[PDB]
Every structure is written in C-alpha cells, then in structure tokens.
Amino acid sequence: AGTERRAKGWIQEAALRMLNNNLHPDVAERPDELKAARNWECYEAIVDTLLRLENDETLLIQSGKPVAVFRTHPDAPRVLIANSNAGSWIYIGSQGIVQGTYETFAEVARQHFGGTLAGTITLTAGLGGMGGAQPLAVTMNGGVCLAIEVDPARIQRRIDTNYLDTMTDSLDAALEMAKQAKEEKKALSIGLVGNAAEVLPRLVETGFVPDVLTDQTSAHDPLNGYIPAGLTLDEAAELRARDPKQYIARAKQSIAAHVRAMLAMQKQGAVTFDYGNNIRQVAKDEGVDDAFSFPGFVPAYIRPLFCEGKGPFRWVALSGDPEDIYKTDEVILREFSDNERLCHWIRMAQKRIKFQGLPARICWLGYGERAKFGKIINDMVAKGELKAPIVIGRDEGMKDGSDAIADWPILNALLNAVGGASWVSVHHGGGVGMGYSIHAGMVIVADGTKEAEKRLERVLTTDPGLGVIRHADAGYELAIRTAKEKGIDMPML
Amino acid sequence: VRPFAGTERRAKGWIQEAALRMLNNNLHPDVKAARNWECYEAIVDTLLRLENDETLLIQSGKPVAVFRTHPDAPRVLIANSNLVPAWATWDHGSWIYIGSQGIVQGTYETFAEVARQHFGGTLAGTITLTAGLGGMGGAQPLAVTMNGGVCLAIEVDPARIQRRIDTNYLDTMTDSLDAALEMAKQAKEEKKALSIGLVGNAAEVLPRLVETGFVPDVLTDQTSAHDPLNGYIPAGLTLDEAAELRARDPKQYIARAKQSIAAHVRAMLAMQKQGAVTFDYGNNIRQVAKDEGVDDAFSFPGFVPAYIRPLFCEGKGPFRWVALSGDPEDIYKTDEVILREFSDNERLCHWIRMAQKRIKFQGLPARICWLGYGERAKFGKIINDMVAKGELKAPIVIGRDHLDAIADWPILNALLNAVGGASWVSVHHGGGVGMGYSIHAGMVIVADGTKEAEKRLERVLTTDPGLGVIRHADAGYELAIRTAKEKGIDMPMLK
Numbered sequence: 001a002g003t004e005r006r007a008k009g010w011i012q013e014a015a016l017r018m019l020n021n022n023l024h025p026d027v028a029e030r031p032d033e034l035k036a037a038r039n040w041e042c043y044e045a046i047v048d049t050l051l052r053l054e055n056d057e058t059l060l061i062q063s064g065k066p067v068a069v070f071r072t073h074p075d076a077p078r079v080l081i082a083n084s085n086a087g088s089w090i091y092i093g094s095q096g097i098v099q100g101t102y103e104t105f106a107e108v109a110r111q112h113f114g115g116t117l118a119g120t121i122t123l124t125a126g127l128g129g130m131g132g133a134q135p136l137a138v139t140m141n142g143g144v145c146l147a148i149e150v151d152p153a154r155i156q157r158r159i160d161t162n163y164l165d166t167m168t169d170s171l172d173a174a175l176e177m178a179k180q181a182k183e184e185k186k187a188l189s190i191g192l193v194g195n196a197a198e199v200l201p202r203l204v205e206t207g208f209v210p211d212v213l214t215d216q217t218s219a220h221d222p223l224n225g226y227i228p229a230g231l232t233l234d235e236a237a238e239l240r241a242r243d244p245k246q247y248i249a250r251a252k253q254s255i256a257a258h259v260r261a262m263l264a265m266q267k268q269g270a271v272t273f274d275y276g277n278n279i280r281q282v283a284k285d286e287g288v289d290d291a292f293s294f295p296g297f298v299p300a301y302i303r304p305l306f307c308e309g310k311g312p313f314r315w316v317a318l319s320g321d322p323e324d325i326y327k328t329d330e331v332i333l334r335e336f337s338d339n340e341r342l343c344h345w346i347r348m349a350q351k352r353i354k355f356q357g358l359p360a361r362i363c364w365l366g367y368g369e370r371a372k373f374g375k376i377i378n379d380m381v382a383k384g385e386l387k388a389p390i391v392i393g394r395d396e397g398m399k400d401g402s403d404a405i406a407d408w409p410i411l412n413a414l415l416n417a418v419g420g421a422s423w424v425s426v427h428h429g430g431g432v433g434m435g436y437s438i439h440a441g442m443v444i445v446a447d448g449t450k451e452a453e454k455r456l457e458r459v460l461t462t463d464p465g466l467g468v469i470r471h472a473d474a475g476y477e478l479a480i481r482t483a484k485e486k487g488i489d490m491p492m493l
Numbered sequence: 494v495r496p497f498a499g500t501e502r503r504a505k506g507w508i509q510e511a512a513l514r515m516l517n518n519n520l521h522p523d524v525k526a527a528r529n530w531e532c533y534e535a536i537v538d539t540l541l542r543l544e545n546d547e548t549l550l551i552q553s554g555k556p557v558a559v560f561r562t563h564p565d566a567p568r569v570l571i572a573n574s575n576l577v578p579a580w581a582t583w584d585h586g587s588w589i590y591i592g593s594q595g596i597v598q599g600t601y602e603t604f605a606e607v608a609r610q611h612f613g614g615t616l617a618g619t620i621t622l623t624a625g626l627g628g629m630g631g632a633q634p635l636a637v638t639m640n641g642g643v644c645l646a647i648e649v650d651p652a653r654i655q656r657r658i659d660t661n662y663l664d665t666m667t668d669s670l671d672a673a674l675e676m677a678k679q680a681k682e683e684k685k686a687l688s689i690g691l692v693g694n695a696a697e698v699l700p701r702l703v704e705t706g707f708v709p710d711v712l713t714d715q716t717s718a719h720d721p722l723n724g725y726i727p728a729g730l731t732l733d734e735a736a737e738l739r740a741r742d743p744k745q746y747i748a749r750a751k752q753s754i755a756a757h758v759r760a761m762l763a764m765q766k767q768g769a770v771t772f773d774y775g776n777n778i779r780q781v782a783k784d785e786g787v788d789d790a791f792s793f794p795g796f797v798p799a800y801i802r803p804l805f806c807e808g809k810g811p812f813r814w815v816a817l818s819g820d821p822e823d824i825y826k827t828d829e830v831i832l833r834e835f836s837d838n839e840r841l842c843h844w845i846r847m848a849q850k851r852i853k854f855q856g857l858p859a860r861i862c863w864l865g866y867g868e869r870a871k872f873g874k875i876i877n878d879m880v881a882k883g884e885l886k887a888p889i890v891i892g893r894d895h896l897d898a899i900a901d902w903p904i905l906n907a908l909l910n911a912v913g914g915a916s917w918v919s920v921h922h923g924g925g926v927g928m929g930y931s932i933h934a935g936m937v938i939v940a941d942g943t944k945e946a947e948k949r950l951e952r953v954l955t956t957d958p959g960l961g962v963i964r965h966a967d968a969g970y971e972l973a974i975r976t977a978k979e980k981g982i983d984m985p986m987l988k
C-alpha cells in the first residue's frame with residue numbers, strides 16, 4: 001500500500017500487491033478460499049519469499065506452489081509461473097468483462113452501422129456473470145438493448161448495480177419502449193423477465209426483427225444452466241433434482257426453437273452471432289443442420305482486431321490513487337483519437353466503471369501502440385507525474401486448420417521472458433477426450449528507471465508482434481499486410 | 494545440404510554457426526530437423542544473416558519470425574508439436590541427436606549403478622542374463638561388457654544376432670545353450686568381459702536354465718513383451734511359424750504369447766529367489782504376467798525406481814557435448830579433463846576410457862556422460878577456458894536432449910534456461926485427443942571461449958540440474974532433499 005515498498009525492489013512489491021489485490025473483498029468471489037495460490041501455506045510462503053527475493057533472483061511457482069528460487073540476473077523475470085488444470089495475478093474485477101463486451105459490439109458497429117449502435121436494437125438473453133455486461137456494452141456504444149432473462153433477481157442485481165436502466169414483465173411493453181429509444185436514437189437497456197425459448201419465437205411471429213442479435217444464456221449447460229420453455233424457476237428445479245433425463249431433453253428442445261427464431265431473424269436481415277455459449281452445437285445435435293448459418297463473435301469480430309495485433313492491454317496503479325489512472329486516461333485521448341471507439345471507451349469508463357481494489361484501466365491497443373504508451377507511462381513515473389509504479393499486463397476456427405497448435409503461447413512466454421517481462425505465466429490443461437489448451441500471460445512493471453524502459457520497449461513490441469505473425473502465418477491478409485506495413489521480420493515472407 | 498565445417502564461421506556469430514552445424518549434423522547419413530526442404534533453406538539463410546542481438550523462432554520446424562532481443566538471450570527458440578488426430582490413435586529435437594552413443598551409455602549407466610549397489614563397483618566376475626537384441630536391447634551386451642561383466646543374451650532372430658556381431662555390439666554367438674553356458678562361466682571364472690548371443694526363445698530357455706540349476710548374478714529382459722501380437726514370439730514357434738499364425742489367427746497367437754510371458758516371468762522369479770539381482774527394463778513384462786495370474790510378478794523392481802531415479806535425485810543426468818571443429822581430438826582432450834577433474838567417480842572414468850576404444854563417432858565427434866549438480870558448471874567453465882586458449886580448435890556445443898501438472902516442470906525448465914542465456918531452447922508438445930498429451934523441453938549452450946558465454950554457462954548449467962533435484966525433493970525423495978540442503982538449493986517450502 002502507498003508510495004513506498006517493503007520488498008527489495010518494485011517488481012517484487014508489484015507481485016505482492018497484485019497477489020493481495022486478487023483476494024480484495026471487492027475484487028474476489030470467495031477470498032477466504034480461492035485460486036491465487038495452491039493453498040494458504042503456499043500463499044504465505046509466496047508472500048514471505050517475495051519480501052526477501054533479491055533483484056537478481058527468480059521465484060518459480062509450480063501450480064500455485066513456490067517450489068524454488070534460482071540466481072538469474074536483474075533483467076530476468078522475478079517470477080515464472082506454470083500452473084496446470086488460476087493466478088497470473090492481474091485480475092481487475094468486472095472491468096475486464098465490461099470492456100471486452102464493449103469491444104465486440106464496437107466492431108459490430110464499425111462493420112455494419114457506421115461505427116455506432118445509435119438507432120439500433122440489440123436483442124439478446126442471459127444477464128448472468130458475463131451476460132450482465134451486455135446491456136452496458138450496448139448502451140456505451142449508443143444502442144438500445146433488450147435483454148431477455150428468466151430470473152427476476154438477476155435483472156434486479158443488474159438494475160441495483162447500474163448495469164441495466166429498466167425492466168418489464170410485458171413483452172409488448174418492452175417492445176414499445178425499445179422502438180421509442182431506437183426512433184429517438186437514445187441509448188437505453190431494458191431487461192424483460194421471460195424465457196428466451198418462449199419470447200424470441202413470439203417476436204418472429206409478431207413481425208419484430210432486431211438490428212443486432214446474440215445470446216448469453218447458459219446453453220453450454222443444459223441441466224444446471226438453461227431453463228427450458230414452459231417451466232418456472234421452482235418447477236424447473238424440482239424436475240432437475242428428480243428427472244434430469246427429461247430436463248436436458250426439454251432444455252435441448254427449448255434451445256432448438258430459440259436458435260430457429262435466431263435463424264429466422266437472421267433471414268429478415270439481423271446481424272446475428274454466437275457468443276461462446278455453445279448454442280449452435282446443442283441445436284444441431286437436437287436436429288437443425290442450419291444452426292451454424294450465423295458465425296461466432298471471435299471469427300466474426302475479434303480475430304480481425306488480433307490480425308492488426310490489437311489486444312487487451314491493462315494497467316494498474318500500485319499507489320492505490322485513482323488520479324494515477326485519470327492521468328494515464330488523458331494520454332490515451334491525446335494520442336489514439338484516430339481510434340474513436342477507444343476514446344469513447346475511456347470517457348464512458350470514467351463515468352460508468354467504478355474501481356475495485358487497486359485502480360486499473362483496460363482497453364485494446366495494437367502493434368506499435370502498446371510500446372508507445374508503455375514508454376510515456378514509464379517517463380511519468382520517473383518525473384513523479386504518477387505517484388508510484390504501474391503494473392502493465394496482458395492475461396477457434398483458424399483459416400488453415402491450426403486451432404490446436406500449442407507452439408504459439410509457448411514461444412510467446414519464452415520470448416516475453418527473454419525480453420525482461422517482470423513475470424510470465426503459462427496455464428496448461430486437458431487430456432484424453434476433451435483436448436488441450438495452453439495460454440501465456442505477461443506482466444511488466446513501469447517503475448520509472450532506464451532499465452525498465454529497455455524491457456518495456458522489448459516486451460511491448462514482441463507480445464503484439466507474435467500475435468500478428470501467428471495470424472499472418474495462418475494466411476490472414478490483414479495480418480500479412482500489418483506485418484509488412486509495420487516491419488515485422490518473417491523469414492518465409 | 495550446404496556444408497558448414499572446420500575452424501572458421503560463415504555466420505555473424507558462433508551460436509548461429511553452431512545452430513547451422515547441429516541442424517546439418519541431424520541430417521547426417523552415419524547419424525526431421527525442419528518442416529520441409531523449403532523451411533530448411535529459410536532456417537539456414539536466416540541463421541547466416543541473424544545478428545547477435547536477434548532471436549529466430551521455429552514453430553514445428555518452420556522459421557516464422559526474427560525479433561530484436563539482446564546478446565545474452567538464446568539466438569533460437571524452438572516450439573514443436575506432433576499431434577496425432579483422434580482417428581489416427583489406434584495406429585498404435587533440440588538438434589542434438591549424436592547417434593547410438595546415447596542408448597549405449599544410458600544402458601551402461603543402468604548396469605554401472607547395479608554394479609555400485611550390488612557387486613562392489615564392477616561387473617567383472619558376474620554373468621548377466623537378458624533377452625532381446627533389438628533397437629534398444631542390442632546395447633545391453635556392450636553396456637555389460639564395458640562394465641567388466643559377462644553377458645549372455647537370448648534372441649529368437651539369428652540374423653539379428655549376426656548383425657550385432659558384424660557391427661561390434663556383440664563378441665560371439667551360438668545356437669547351443671550348453672556352449673553359451675560353458676563360455677559364460679569360463680569368462681566369469683577368469684573375470685574376463687565377454688558378450689554371447691544365444692539363438693533361442695527366452696520363454697523356453699529360462700525355464701530350462703532354472704531346471705538345470707544355473708543362476709545368473711544379474712537378470713533382466715528387453716524382449717518386446719509390450720506387444721504380444723507383433724513383438725513377443727511365443728514358445729514353440731519359429732519366426733516363420735510365428736508370422737503365419739500372427740496373420741491367420743491373432744487370438745491364438747496372443748494367448749500363446751501372454752502364456753509364454755507368464756512362463757518367462759515365473760522363471761525370473763525362480764532365479765531371483767535363488768539370488769539373481771533381477772529387474773524390469775521398461776518392456777511391460779511384469780504387468781502382462783500379473784494379468785495372466787502370476788500374483789508375485791511385481792516382486793522384482795523396475796530399473797528406474799531401483800537404479801536411475803536415485804541418480805536424478807542427486808541431479809545427475811545425461812550431459813552431452815559436441816566438437817564443432819569436427820576434430821575427434823577436441824573430444825579426447827575434454828575426456829582427459831573428465832579423467833583429471835572427476836577421478837573420484839570410477840564408473841564415469843571407466844566409461845570415458847572404454848568409450849574411446851568401443852564407441853565410434855557418428856557425424857560430429859560427441860561425448861555423453863552423466864554429471865550432476867555442481868559438476869556440470871565446473872566442466873562447462875574448463876571447456877570454455879580451453880576454447881578461449883585455443884586448446885580446442887572451435888567452440889563446443891553442450892546440450893541436454895528432451896528425454897496435467899507433470900507438464901509444469903518442462904515449461905519452467907525451458908523458461909529458466911532461456912532467461913539464464915541458453916544458446917537455444919526447445920519445447921516439444923506430443924500426443925492427441927484419445928491418448929493424452931506430453932511436454933518435453935531441451936536446451937543447448939555454446940562454450941565459445943568468451944566472458945559473456947562463461948556467465949551464461951554458470952547460470953544455465955546450475956539451473957538445469959537444480960530443477961530436477963527440486964522436483965524430486967518436492968515429491969518427497971530423501972536423497973533429493975539431502976542434495977538440496979547440502980548444495981544450498983533455495984526451496985521455500987522445504988522443512
């Protein structure tokens with residue numbers, strides 16, 4: 001806490017503060033349990049080791065356990081994390097979810113509606129742990145959001161907590177309000193209590209077709225998640241404890257009419273996509289081969305941002321001072337104003353997002369942009385324009401069939417570690433039957449020094465540049481163009 | 494294949510040059526390295542122009558990027574995948590392969606540890622009885638005789654036995670069990686080293702040897718017992734009678750194979766009972782016999798828990814080095830420093846002396862032996878001083894070849910070696926849906942005589958073996974806990 005460190009260096013102190021932040025009451029789900037470390041003896045050992053860790057030593061964390069310290073050198077990572085199957089330490093609460101959903105709907109606006117959702121109605125369902133960000137993301141893009149949700153207490157949570165403007169139990173009341181806001185081109189979110197399987201076919205039936213259409217119900221879990229059509233919450237739960245065979249069947253049967261309504265709304269001209277809740281697979285498996293007529297949001301909207309290297313870039317103010325983040329908020333406005341969805345994001349975040357634990361911001365920045373911003377941030381820490389160091393961090397239908405290749409995140413971890421990232425993480429997991437994933441993340445500390453400035457320049461070129469190469473190698477034009485445009489060295493091109 | 498050879502480099506630096514020479518050494522006839530010939534030419538072209546502060550990335554044999562890094566980073570990072578698609582499931586590196594010296598000295602290491610544990614440090618005056626002269630089994634005769642022992646090896650294929658004699662893996666052969674037996678006891682009495690291949694089926698020969706009162710000092714097996722349809726030959730069948738049965742009636746073959754293996758294993762239990770030091774050499778024979786109802790099949794140990802695991806606990810492992818000059822005398826000079834500097838370790842020094850007579854170089858001259866924690870960095874520095882002085886004609890490549898939660902360790906090892914300044918680092922990802930996945934990591938470091946290389950050698954030759962000790966100390970092995978505490982390895986959770 002504050003402007004002075006208890007550890008022997010600011011990277012070790014950042015690790016301590018990010019670790020402690022992960023179990024902050026306003027950041028964590030159940031901080032008395034979950035996981036930042038394997039168990040509470042490992043947690044205490046990590047903290048004790050980070051306070052006495054020297055500036056030329058490196059701590060190894062092996063699935064949450066501090067297993068060893070080795071002498072390395074001052075420009076090596078102070079920590080290397082390989083966890084099996086979640087602590088890469090830079091979770092910043094709900095702002096990651098909100099801004100990632102903002103970004104999807106921001107690309108949907110650029111591709112189809114002139115760079116804003118003003119005058120459109122997005123129709124979706126599910127306001128749960130991730131779905132509840134949908135209405136704020138849509139309204140922050142200027143749009144009208146109608147969100148169908150079966151649990152009134154989830155609509156009330158999103159309203160009480162300012163993620164949702166209003167609600168109604170009446171579909172034609174929800175409809176008459178959405179059309180008003182669309183005609184006035186006003187931003188407005190309405191939660192309609194109701195079942196997507198029942199409501200969406202009633203909309204197609206009655207002529208209505210939204211401009212944008214997704215879903216974020218728990219369709220990936222047709223027993224404990226998706227409520228089947230014709231069932232109240234208490235009726236559904238009494239069938240779920242008793243007769244899960246005929247629950248999943250009704251649940252899969254209801255997912256089918258839901259998607260057939262989405263398919264029908266797609267032919268009337270709606271821009272419509274899947275949001276990772278596995279809902280086409282369950283509908284095809286129930287008997288509609290057309291299910292994949294609409295695409296997933298990642299191949300449709302995120303992948304092209306990855307082709308120019310753009311990715312979630314986060315930074316945390318270790319001082320615990322919100323003005324540190326407001327100062328770095330302006331520098332994004334001064335120098336990425338050609339990207340107005342990004343500048344619109346910073347201003348709407350300043351007014352809608354509250355801080356949780358350490359003040360933090362996230363937004364998307366491409367190749368070239370990240371190193372630029374890390375260099376400016378590091379200078380302001382050195383001058384004292386910022387009160388203490390900044391933690392900077394970053395936590396699939398591929399053209400060429402390359403979905404399963406684990407080589408890329410391993411080269412990413414290896415290359416960021418060799419560049420002098422402050423800590424590097426690799427999470428890996430899978431086995432027989434369900435496959436294998438690997439993900440690498442990285443943190444770099446901007447502590448004001450000239451040595452940090454060299455590592456910052458290396459690591460913030462290398463991390464986005466390898467995402468560009470990964471997509472250029474897979475044959476994406478925009479990535480081959482970006483690589484040539486920006487000077488990235490590809491021996492085969 | 495474009496030659497790069499001798500005392501001069503064509504690349505901007507000697508790590509880049511070493512990568513070229515090791516890349517080409519793997520494609521040597523007397524010994525794939527890239528994805529295809531087009532990737533091979535781009536790697537070679539890129540390595541010739543690669544600067545000393547740049548790093549090349551190889552993704553599954555293909556050079557995909559060069560990035561500015563720094564002079565103490567690896568010049569090459571390699572990440573390779575060999576995934577088998579689900580449908581292909583039932584159909585059953587760091588550029589440092591150095592031929593069959595690896596398999597010969599790994600097997601020597603097993604029988605040297607048996608000699609340390611049970612026969613006072615030598616196999617002179619002992620008979621080891623084994624079976625299988627195949628791709629790995631064929632190294633057993635040399636590994637036993639180089640340890641001073643007599644070796645009697647049963648093998649069903651007579652033409653396979655003659656190829657081992659033709660090729661200096663085996664001293665002699667016979668189809669007479671009594672001739673083989675009188676030759677082996679003769680040599681045991683004279684304490685002479687001798688290997689004898691007997692043409693025979695181990696499931697017939699071993700039961701007979703138990704009946705005649707013959708007992709070996711040491712007993713193993715490297716038959717193909719892991720594959721009872723296509724590997725193990727059932728008792729009573731010639732190779733031709735085995736191949737006809739294999740194809741016509743698979744289930745009768747498998748039943749005779751498994752029941753022969755039960756017979757084979759029961760005879761090994763009978764010799765262990767009468768005093769043979771006996772162990773499993775990774776061929777699944779105990780488990781097949783257990784599944785056939787031999788309830789005491791696991792009453793002899795597997796070779797790694799019994800002999801190799803304790804060497805890993807003290808950090809000891811395969812340490813290989815390659816003379817980039819091509820001069821076999823670069824290797825013989827570094828052998829002499831093993832003989833002066835580790836003269837305490839008798840089986841190491843005996844290995845070096847016997848290797849100079851018995852191992853022929855394949856491709857670039859190279860040596861393998863097992864060195865542990867502390868010993869590797871000490872050897873690494875003397876070699877770097879000898880290259881600096883011109884006592885070696887060119888730089889030396891030093892390497893450790895590749896050989897969920899288990900997977901954390903190779904990832905930390907790769908990340909740690911990269912950060913310490915390994916010259917290059919490789920991660921291999923293998924397996925598929927339907928069989929599970931594996932990760933292996935290797936590294937190379939080049940001793941080029943510079944002060945910058947000396948600092949990287951000190952870090953990397955310390956972190957690579959220290960991590961294997963820590964893995965064993967964490968898992969509860971007292972030998973590894975003792976090593977961590979004596980050597981000062983920093984382990985935050987230990988005691």
Ligand SMILES: NC(=O)c1ccc[n+]([C@@H]2O[C@H](COP(=O)([O-])OP(=O)(O)OC[C@H]3O[C@@H](n4cnc5c(N)ncnc54)[C@H](O)[C@@H]3O)[C@@H](O)[C@H]2O)c1
Nearest residue numbers: 126128129130131149150195196216217218226227276277
């Ligand atoms: N890959 C991504 O970036 C990404 C992002 C956001 C969401 N998702 C996916 O979307 C899904 C939702 O995630 P979550 O964390 O919000 O799940 P959640 O379980 O917390 O929320 C699902 C919501 O759907 C509601 N619901 C269930 N049946 C309904 C029905 N028939 N009609 C209307 N509402 C219904 C539930 O009451 C709940 O509020 C998950 O599959 C998630 O993986 C993926």
Ligand SMILES: NC(=O)c1ccc[n+]([C@@H]2O[C@H](COP(=O)([O-])OP(=O)(O)OC[C@H]3O[C@@H](n4cnc5c(N)ncnc54)[C@H](O)[C@@H]3O)[C@@H](O)[C@H]2O)c1
Nearest residue numbers: 625627628629630648649694695715716717725726775776
């Ligand atoms: N895990 C390890 O480090 C390790 C090391 C060495 C060997 N092994 C195991 O040892 C086994 C042998 O390996 P390999 O590569 O040499 O196999 P391989 O197929 O080349 O050779 C096996 C040999 O067994 C012989 N054979 C089959 N039935 C026989 C019988 N009834 N009596 C006598 N000989 C018989 C064959 O003729 C053949 O030459 C394998 O199962 C291997 O996995 C494991």
